[PDB]
Design a protein around this ligand. Structure first.
Ligand code: PBE
Ligand code: ZN
Ligand code: ZN
Ligand code: ZN
Ligand code: ZN
Length: 270
């Protein structure tokens, strides 16, 4: 069988898509990573129509963006998981094959020297300044229901200007003062490297984003394939994902080679 794996445009998507490809290839499959489709909704549409067979999604995204479910009073990681697994199955036959073992959350970040000068530590501290700050979005956060609309609704403010750019460009943009705030990805060590400060989400606006492998209904009938995917259950924690991402964004290593090195070290390929 030919297995096509989707990807959103950033480090860990490339790495994990290649890591899954390698594992599937080791178990008799022909696997390929498909790049360039776009973001969340284009990948999920492609999965439903069988253009792709699986990709790496996140619980909070599936809940808010795909299932368009209503935020509960308090975010609970396992509740959101349980409802995404039920909800994806009920709606489109999509199966949650595995939990990878890490969260990659959106977290609002600013420059650390500015934050220290202004006593900013939490998102609600931004209220004073927000209408004078430029927001640098990735392709999705500005328009997603759990993005800037959710910050507006929960915290009661909007930024002065919104610019959108591909995910990896956010970190240099804020460092170089092209923007003042970004929805940094928490598995990206460029937050520390470029002297940025992640702010506490003190009013609990944003959900947990636990990485999960999702598979379309027809592909999931393949029990051998599902069981290869489950070899990765809980195997990748946040510090591991961050290390691998660094090898991609800073060391400029090829995603296939980063994945291959990890699989060998963990004994998943000999
Ligand atoms: C992983 N996230 C929740 C944070 C980074 C991009 C977004 C998503 O891919 O849904
Ligand atoms: Zn003002
Ligand atoms: Zn588990
Ligand atoms: Zn670890
Ligand atoms: Zn070896």
């Amino acid at each position: 069988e030919r297995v096509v794996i989707g990807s959103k445009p950033f480090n860990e998507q490339y790495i994990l898509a290649n890591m899954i490809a390698i594992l599937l290839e080791e178990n008799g499959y022909k696997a390929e990573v498909k790049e360039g489709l776009g973001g969340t909704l284009v990948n999920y549409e492609a999965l439903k129509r069988n253009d792709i067979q699986l990709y790496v999604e996140y619980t909070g995204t599936a809940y808010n963006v795909i299932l368009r479910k209503q935020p509960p009073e308090l975010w609970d990681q396992q509740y959101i998981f349980d409802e995404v697994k039920k909800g994806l199955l009920e709606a489109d036959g999509v199966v949650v094959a595995a939990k990878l073992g890490f969260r990659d959350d959106y977290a609002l970040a600013v420059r650390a020297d500015w934050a220290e000068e202004n006593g900013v530590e939490k998102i609600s501290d931004l209220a004073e300044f927000a209408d004078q700050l430029v927001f640098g979005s990735d392709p999705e956060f500005a328009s997603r229901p759990d993005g800037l609309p959710q910050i507006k609704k929960v915290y009661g403010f909007e930024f002065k200007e919104v610019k959108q750019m591909e995910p990896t460009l956010m970190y240099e943009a804020i460092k170089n003062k092209q923007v003042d705030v970004i929805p940094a990805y928490t598995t990206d060590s460029r937050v520390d490297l470029f002297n940025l400060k992640i702010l506490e989400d003190d009013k609990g606006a944003l959900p947990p984003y636990d990485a999960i492998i999702i598979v379309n209904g027809n592909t999931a009938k393949d029990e051998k394939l599902i069981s290869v995917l489950k070899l990765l259950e809980d195997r990748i924690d946040t510090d591991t994902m961050r290390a691998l991402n660094y090898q991609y964004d800073v060391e400029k290593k090829d995603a296939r080679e980063i994945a291959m090195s990890f699989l060998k070290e963990q004994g998943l390929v000999k």
